[PDB]
Ligand binder design. Structure first.
Ligand SMILES: *[C@@H]1O[C@H](CO)[C@@H](O[C@@H]2O[C@H](CO)[C@@H](O)[C@H](O)[C@H]2NC(C)=O)[C@H](O)[C@H]1NC(C)=O
Ligand SMILES: *[C@@H]1O[C@H](CO)[C@@H](O)[C@H](O)[C@H]1NC(C)=O
Ligand SMILES: *[C@@H]1O[C@H](CO)[C@@H](O)[C@H](O)[C@H]1NC(C)=O
Ligand SMILES: *[C@@H]1O[C@H](CO)[C@@H](O)[C@H](O)[C@H]1NC(C)=O
Ligand SMILES: *[C@@H]1O[C@H](CO)[C@@H](O)[C@H](O)[C@H]1NC(C)=O
Ligand SMILES: *[C@@H]1O[C@H](CO)[C@@H](O)[C@H](O)[C@H]1NC(C)=O
Ligand SMILES: *[C@@H]1O[C@H](CO)[C@@H](O)[C@H](O)[C@H]1NC(C)=O
Ligand SMILES: *[C@@H]1O[C@H](CO)[C@@H](O)[C@H](O)[C@H]1NC(C)=O
Ligand SMILES: *[C@@H]1O[C@H](CO)[C@@H](O)[C@H](O)[C@H]1NC(C)=O
Ligand SMILES: *[C@@H]1O[C@H](CO)[C@@H](O)[C@H](O)[C@H]1NC(C)=O
Ligand SMILES: *[C@@H]1O[C@H](CO)[C@@H](O)[C@H](O)[C@H]1NC(C)=O
Ligand SMILES: [Ca+2]
Ligand SMILES: [Ca+2]
Lengths: 1082, 167, 83
């Protein structure tokens, strides 16, 4: 009980723990940090006690008794040894130095004052005295030991654990002549401890009256036997009881899995300027804030983490990006913002540290100009002058490898230096002298320049892979990953060299931690706090600018925020993204859609209600297919179509904002359906079903009451229809091969399509006629989606990985315009704006479905040139009032489907359902219908042994299943008698054909059958027929009382699952599933 | 030539006019220069990924993998365009097949057949040089071949290789 | 090199003659070079207690040349002109 955490951070691979019960202290060793460390037993204050000449410390033991005050540890690095020290580290000695190779674990015997030590290469257990001058062997030259790890003692017994044998062993601690196994099949036993009062003897505590402020450590030093110690980052005072806190700067080093603190005195080799960060992955960059003593780093995917230099707080602080991992960090300490770099999204972004609610936006993204970000790798900021600097590898689309400058709100862009920058690492800024430093790995140089783009020069030569840079005072510090070195030089000339650390693998970038104060560096956002609603960003001249988070826009007051209402939404297989039509606005117009299960193919929008709908496809995972809607602010996410999707998935989404309807194309292997679903309801209908045609991309026009679709199957075409598909016309039948994209213009009455197999963009008028071409050539190789807005068409190209805008009139030959560049796996684009979705009656030509769904109960359809609505039923049939729905009184089919009963019509071209689908307990296998009471009788399987019978009523209003014979065997066969009002059933589990009365009152058994399945009855001739699929499968005839029995068919039957009788012809039909054939007889 | 060559595709030579043509994909350009390292210029703009180049007669032919196209232009100015094939996936480089004859292009190795023992390689000024296969060295007569007897042998996990101490 | 021991062996070229000249567990002979002009056999050990050692062509004598300032000696060359 009472599981609680002592150390929350700074541990990498703890080999051994010791606890000092007198001093209320805890000690531990670490292999990777190569350290022995001490802290209060609650973990509050920690210190590094031994770091010199420590390589692989594995074992640790203590004697805290008054006058002993001694600790022992083992090292299995080169020159393996066992060492003794004072519990404060003030005295150090080596006590076992020979006949030792892989010394694993240590234990102490307090009455005898002996040290017990164990070796895994020479395979022994030995004991010696505290000075190592008496030595003896307990177990030696014995094959019992294979790979011992840990050791404990109790009375005259010694216990240990072995990793080779996966075993825990007991022996006699003096000669080993008695041996036993405590455990036999442990996964791997690493550590062992023995618990009894005798293992922690009592003794006086010197520290009980001491006044040390942070740590009091037992000491072997006469007369007071204690000493005061300070934590990491602290100093000790000449009073020798108090500690002070070092304000001096220190250096932060980043490594693939660790972050370290180093001291700017190169002769101090201990890495203890701060508690290390010991659990990172893919470390590249780090930032710090001194006003709260925090260190910040990035964690995949899209998360930022912060920790305090004392280890006291460690948390995941904000999500950075839904689209990919961030790489580079910069911090503004005046406005309290963190700028970061996202290469996969090709963006530079800002996040707010102030307040309880996180806000973030995108400042710069790839827009096809050379000035935008191509592939950014390093970022620096100047808050006082409101400037941002970054290093970029460029892109093949046109962004050069460069050092670039901007204003901290993104409103200006400049290229300062380019050329001879093939492999370009981070950029750093000297703010006092206003000079930028960067590193070119392809030439092994560190280069310097002015912030205005002048005076480029080389400062350091002959490097191999300079990964990290930082400038502080008169000195420049850099790290090299091939030389495995951290070095310091003088920034004026680079003419002196000092080496801080060497042989460091997996080096990464460096920072320097110092007291940078906001009062001196103050700017507009610091001078005008609480000005902006969401984000404040400085700009040159002491001025400030207000910024609004993703999905929101800034309002003409310059301080307030309001959602976007005019943007374009683009689909790509991994995501859905929104962009502003203002080419200078690099912000995200909507919170992106990204994550597990997203394989988006099409997106549509409902502007009035503020929703975006999209479809997802997967050939290997059923649940990953469907239609889903979200809001541009990411608030509410829901699934609208998940049931009944074909193998080829949904390949179309159109939304009718007037009627509140959604149209989609559902593609099976050998056929396709066009379906409609009423939003916020469980109403779904099939409007078209076709096999030789292949409707794929669908768009809807409620203003002119038309529904258009594009088909790129065999005999490709573009078609027009009504909102219920009751009319079909073909607009384009020639010069069309792979039409994949369909857009409609309300202002001109034109529909636009793109074909990537002809490399063409074209328009045709909805009434038909000639066809016009808008863009054509070797260019425009793979246009996949198109939309129309104003005097412009906006389309997406897969090969060029670009989003283009051009003028929608044929004959224009101006070069296109680019909105975003380097977007992978593109799919179509649509637009979100009130103009494209009018809701006024005068603008919608008085559509009847605009108000209260036209009064139709289920579905409302507005047909052309009709002043009244037309109504459709998702289930049932439509009545004389023309607006309500009721269940059919004609003749139809009923069939069971797992947990439900469903209805079907004899006419294949009728897509009405006679009644809504009914849900029942278990799995239903039986159907018979009673014409007097208008009810259905069915049989249910509840488990592999238990069955049930039930009846449900059709026309007596709404009804639910009612149960008969709540306990029978697995039953699948039912027949009803209309002359006697009796029920007959086929009990498989109990090998019997049974009869029952309509009310469930009276029960009888008619026959015993090996494997009975089906029953047929003729009451006006007193005969019964059934089928048996047991060995010697047969069809048998009997009398309704069972008094005669004869086989009618006993040849060429294997699995006669179905039986039927036709009284118009007096013919008996049966079906066999093994012979796979249907036969008829008399 | 160097500089502004981040993504550099094949190089081809016009032998009659002695001019080198190359393509820079990072800028979408076909560039031309003299064989002596002078008169660099851009001849074709606005390409996407020019993968293949060939020059024949008055015409320059190139293939683009993103436009999925093979196109012909006039090598003097690039001011006329003809399209040979389109919608071709996975395009790669092009050559032109024609009757290039040795009699006109003769050199030292053609004029002195059977001179070298193993390999003959031309050099400027009509002269020829003799070359010897891997593992062998050339002998002071300038024509014969004999095994190396002074070299350093280096080991790497995938291979063992030998290098001459003559840099 | 085995898991817990190492052998130094000699084989006569173009013959099926093979002999073991040294077998050691706590030392880790790895890189070996030979000098027939001065009749010495040198090796480098980068195990625990790393060292460089000299011996005879049958390993019947052993001496340590470098025992300090040596951690991971992986490479051994001999010069006939300077010794
Ligand atoms: C379907 O239900 C949603 C709510 O789940 C309705 O959305 C609301 O629409 C009104 C009017 O535009 C907005 O003021 C609300 O903010 C919306 N709610 C939410 C949670 O965003 C929607 O109108 C309904 N109808 C359709 C066709 O979607
Ligand atoms: C560390 O080892 C070196 C070499 O044996 C020795 O000179 C030095 O005194 C040792 N220092 C400590 C603190 O053990
Ligand atoms: C240890 O083993 C010996 C031999 O079986 C036996 O005589 C002795 O009693 C054992 N000791 C204990 C404590 O069981
Ligand atoms: C802390 O100690 C270091 C020497 O180890 C010294 O350089 C520094 O100035 C001290 N700082 C304070 C605040 O005492
Ligand atoms: C984390 O920080 C908060 C606020 O300063 C503090 O109350 C809390 O104690 C910290 N966590 C730990 C484990 O100390
Ligand atoms: C919309 O999302 C909010 C959370 O942001 C939730 O509280 C609310 O209930 C949601 N609205 C509906 C209708 O589900
Ligand atoms: C439906 O289409 C036919 C052609 O198939 C056309 O003649 C008819 O006019 C259309 N319906 C209406 C109401 O125009
Ligand atoms: C099928 O019916 C069983 C029993 O009613 C139910 O548990 C299961 O979820 C159903 N599965 C499907 C795919 O309908
Ligand atoms: C069927 O159940 C009845 C009633 O428990 C029992 O008498 C009969 O023996 C069972 N028969 C079979 C074949 O399980
Ligand atoms: C098969 O059925 C016929 C007709 O009822 C009968 O005469 C014959 O004996 C049956 N044979 C077998 C093997 O059951
Ligand atoms: C062999 O080594 C010993 C030292 O171990 C040395 O005294 C002796 O001289 C050596 N043998 C010869 C023949 O020199
Ligand atoms: Ca062992
Ligand atoms: Ca194409």
């Amino acid at each position: 009980t009472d599981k609680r955490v002592v150390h929350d951070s700074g541990l990498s691979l703890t080999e051994m723990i010791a606890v000092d019960w007198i001093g209320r202290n805890i000690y531990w060793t670490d292999y990777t940090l190569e350290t022995i460390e001490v802290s209060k037993i609650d973990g509050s204050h920690r210190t590094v006690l031994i770091s010199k000449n420590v390589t692989k410390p594995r074992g640790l033991a203590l004697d805290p008794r008054m006058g002993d005050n001694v600790m022992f540890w083992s090292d299995w690095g080169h020159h393996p040894r066992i060492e003794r020290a004072s519990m404060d580290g003030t005295m150090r000695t080596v006590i076992v130095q020979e006949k030792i190779y892989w010394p694993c674990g240590l234990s102490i015997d307090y009455p005898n004052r002996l040290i017990y030590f164990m070796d895994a290469y020479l395979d022994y257990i030995e004991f010696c005295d505290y000075d190592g001058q008496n030595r003896r062997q307990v177990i030696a030259s014995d094959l019992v030991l294979h790979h011992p790890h840990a050791l404990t003692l109790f009375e005259d017994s010694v216990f240990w654990t072995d990793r080779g044998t996966h075993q825990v062993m007991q022996a006699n601690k003096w000669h080993g002549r008695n041996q036993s196994v405590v455990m036999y099949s442990v996964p791997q036993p690493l550590g062992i401890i023995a618990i009894h009062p005798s293992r922690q003897p009592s003794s006086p505590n010197p520290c009980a009256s001491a006044t040390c402020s942070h740590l009091c450590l037992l000491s072997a030093q006469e007369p007071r036997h204690y000493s005061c110690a300070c934590p990491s980052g602290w100093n000790l005072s000449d009073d020798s009881v108090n500690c002070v806190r070092g304000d001096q700067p220190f250096l932060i080093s980043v490594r693939e899995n660790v972050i370290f603190g180093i001291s700017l005195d190169p002769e101090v080799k201990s890495n203890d300027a701060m508690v290390p960060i010991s659990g990172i992955q893919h470390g590249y960059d780090v930032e710090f804030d001194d006003s709260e003593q925090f260190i910040y780093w990035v964690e995949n995917p899209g998360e930022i983490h912060r920790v305090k230099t004392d280890g006291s707080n460690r948390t995941a602080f904000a999500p950075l990006s839904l689209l990919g991992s961030s790489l580079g960090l910069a911090l503004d300490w005046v406005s309290r913002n963190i700028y970061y770099t996202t290469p996969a999204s090709r963006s530079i972004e800002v996040l707010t540290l102030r307040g309880d609610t996180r806000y973030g936006k995108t400042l710069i993204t790839n827009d096809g100009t050379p000035l935008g970000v191509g592939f950014p790798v390093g970022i620096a900021v100047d808050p006082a002058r409101g400037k941002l600097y970054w290093s970029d590898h460029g892109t093949d689309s046109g962004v050069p490898a460069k050092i670039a400058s901007a204003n901290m709100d993104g409103t200006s862009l400049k290229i300062l230096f380019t050329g001879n920058m093939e492999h370009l690492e981070v950029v750093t800024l000297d703010i006092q002298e206003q000079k930028l430093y960067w590193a070119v790995t392809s030439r092994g140089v560190i280069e310097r320049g002015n912030v205005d783009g002048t005076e480029r020069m080389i400062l350091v030569h002959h490097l191999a892979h300079p990964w990290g840079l930082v400038v502080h005072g008169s000195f420049l510090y850099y790290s090299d990953e091939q030389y495995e070195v951290i070095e310091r030089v003088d920034k004026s000339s680079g003419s002196n060299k000092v080496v801080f650390r060497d042989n460091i693998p997996y080096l990464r970038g460096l920072r320097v931690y110092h007291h940078r104060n906001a009062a001196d560096s103050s700017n507009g956002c610091s001078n005008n706090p609480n000005a902006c609603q969401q984000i404040c960003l400085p700009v040159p001249g002491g001025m400030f600018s207000c910024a609004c988070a993703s999905g929101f826009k800034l309002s003409p007051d310059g301080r307030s925020c309001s959602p976007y209402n005019s943007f374009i939404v683009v689909s790509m297989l991994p995501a859905v993204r929104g962009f502003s039509l203002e080419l200078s606005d690099h912000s995200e117009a909507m919170v992106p859609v990204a994550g597990q299960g997203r394989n988006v193919l099409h997106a549509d929008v409902d502007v009035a209600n503020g929703f975006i709908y999209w479809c997802d496809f997967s050939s290997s995972v059923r649940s990953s297919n469907g239609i889903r809607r979200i809001k541009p602010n990411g608030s509410n996410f829901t699934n609208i179509v998940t049931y009944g999707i074909g193998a080829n998935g949904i390949r179309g989404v159109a939304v009718d904002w007037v009627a509140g309807n959604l149209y989609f194309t559902n593609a099976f292997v050998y056929e396709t359906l066009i379906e409609v679903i009423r939003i916020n309801t469980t109403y779904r209908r099939v409007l078209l079903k076709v096999s030789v045609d292949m409707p794929r991309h669908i768009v809807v026009d409620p203003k002119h009451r038309y529904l258009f679709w594009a088909d790129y199957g065999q005999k490709p075409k573009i078609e027009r229809s009504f909102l219920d598909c009751t009319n079909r016309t073909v607009l384009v039948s020639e010069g069309i091969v792979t039409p994949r994209g369909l857009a409609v213009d309300h202002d001109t009455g034109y529909i636009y399509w793109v074909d990537d197999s002809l490399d063409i963009i074209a328009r045709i008028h909805r009434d038909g006629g000639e066809s016009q071409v808008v863009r054509y050539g070797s260019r425009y190789p793979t246009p996949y989606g198109i939309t129309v807005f104003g005097e412009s068409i906006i389309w997406v190209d897969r090969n060029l990985r670009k989003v283009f805008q051009a003028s929608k009139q044929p004959g224009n030959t101006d070069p296109p315009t680019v909105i975003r560049d380097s977007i992978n796996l593109l799919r179509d684009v649509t637009i979100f704006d009130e103009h494209v979705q009018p809701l006024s009656p005068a603008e919608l030509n008085n559509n009847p479905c605009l108000q209260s769904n036209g009064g139709c109960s289920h579905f409302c359809f507005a047909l052309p040139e009709l002043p009244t609505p037309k109504c459709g039923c998702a289930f049932g049939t439509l009545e004389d009032d023309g607006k309500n729905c009721a269940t059919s009184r004609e003749d139809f089919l009923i069939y069971s489907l797992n947990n439900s009963l469903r209805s079907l019509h004899f006419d294949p071209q009728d897509h009405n359902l006679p009644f809504q689908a009914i849900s029942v307990e278990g799995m239903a296998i039986a159907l018979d219908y009673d014409r007097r009471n208008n009810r259905i009788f069915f049989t249910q399987k509840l488990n592999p042994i238990r069955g049930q019978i039930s009846y449900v009523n059709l026309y007596s209003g709404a009804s639910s299943p009612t149960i008969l014979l709540s306990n029978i065997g697995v039953t699948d066969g039912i027949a009803f008698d209309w002359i006697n009002r009796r029920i007959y059933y086929s009990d498989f589990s109990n090998q019997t054909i049974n009869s029952m009365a309509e009310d469930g009152s009276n029960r009888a058994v008619i026959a015993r059958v090996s494997k009975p399945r089906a029953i047929v009855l003729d009451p006006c001739r007193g005969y019964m027929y059934w089928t048996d699929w047991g060995t010697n499968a047969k069809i048998e005839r009997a009398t309704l009382g069972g008094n005669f029995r004869v086989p009618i068919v006993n040849t060429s039957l294997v699995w006669p699952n179905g039986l039927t009788l036709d009284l118009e012809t007096d013919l008996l039909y049966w079906a066999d599933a093994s012979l796979q054939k249907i036969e008829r007889s008399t």
